[PDB]
Amino acid sequence: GLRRAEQNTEDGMSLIQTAEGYLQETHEIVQRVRVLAVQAANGIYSEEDRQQIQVE
Amino acid sequence: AALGLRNPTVLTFISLSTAGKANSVIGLCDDALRVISKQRADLGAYYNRMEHAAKG
């Protein structure tokens, strides 16, 4: 059982590390929209530009 | 046709033989480039989209 118990903790480490691999992806996307936002708060953009920005 | 340079049905395109029509073409070009810029902003979103998908 202890040999079996060791493997599951290893498999459990895989699943935990797997999910955090996706969480890294989303944070890169969320921070891109965040930096995309602060450019859209600028005052020299026409309506088409902020509409084009919205599409991405 | 989708740009506005040529009539899709009549199959004739804009002429610049007179001064008055030229300032009307100025607006079309702003619209035509608005059409193109929007699509490239679409494809730029597609181009960025895959990289976020690929990395994960």
Side-chain angles (χ1 to χ4, degrees):
Chain A
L2 281 172
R3 213 58 194 84
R4 183 59 241 175
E6 199 275 336
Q7 305 180 40
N8 283 86
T9 316
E10 210 85 4
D11 296 357
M13 276 189 294
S14 305
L15 189 152
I16 294 175
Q17 193 176 4
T18 301
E20 221 285 288
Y22 296 102
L23 305 175
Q24 175 171 357
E25 172 187 5
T26 307
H27 195 102
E28 266 278 6
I29 305 176
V30 177
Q31 245 162 214
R32 172 57 187 171
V33 186
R34 160 68 184 90
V35 64
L36 261 180
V38 82
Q39 187 187 354
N42 196 314
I44 60 175
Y45 284 90
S46 61
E47 276 58 35
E48 290 78 14
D49 292 327
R50 252 175 269 90
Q51 182 182 355
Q52 289 185 11
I53 284 185
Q54 174 63 15
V55 184
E56 192 160 345
Chain B
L3 302 185
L5 293 170
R6 175 193 279 97
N7 195 316
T9 302
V10 192
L11 303 180
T12 67
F13 55 92
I14 56 179
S15 175
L16 287 184
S17 60
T18 322
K21 301 203 287 294
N23 185 85
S24 66
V25 175
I26 297 186
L28 308 182
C29 294
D30 310 331
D31 295 2
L33 296 172
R34 168 194 52 84
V35 174
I36 301 177
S37 179
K38 165 69 181 301
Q39 180 58 29
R40 298 187 72 176
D42 302 330
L43 288 179
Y46 291 119
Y47 188 45
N48 282 341
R49 168 162 205 178
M50 318 308 298
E51 291 179 295
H52 295 94
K55 184 183 307 302

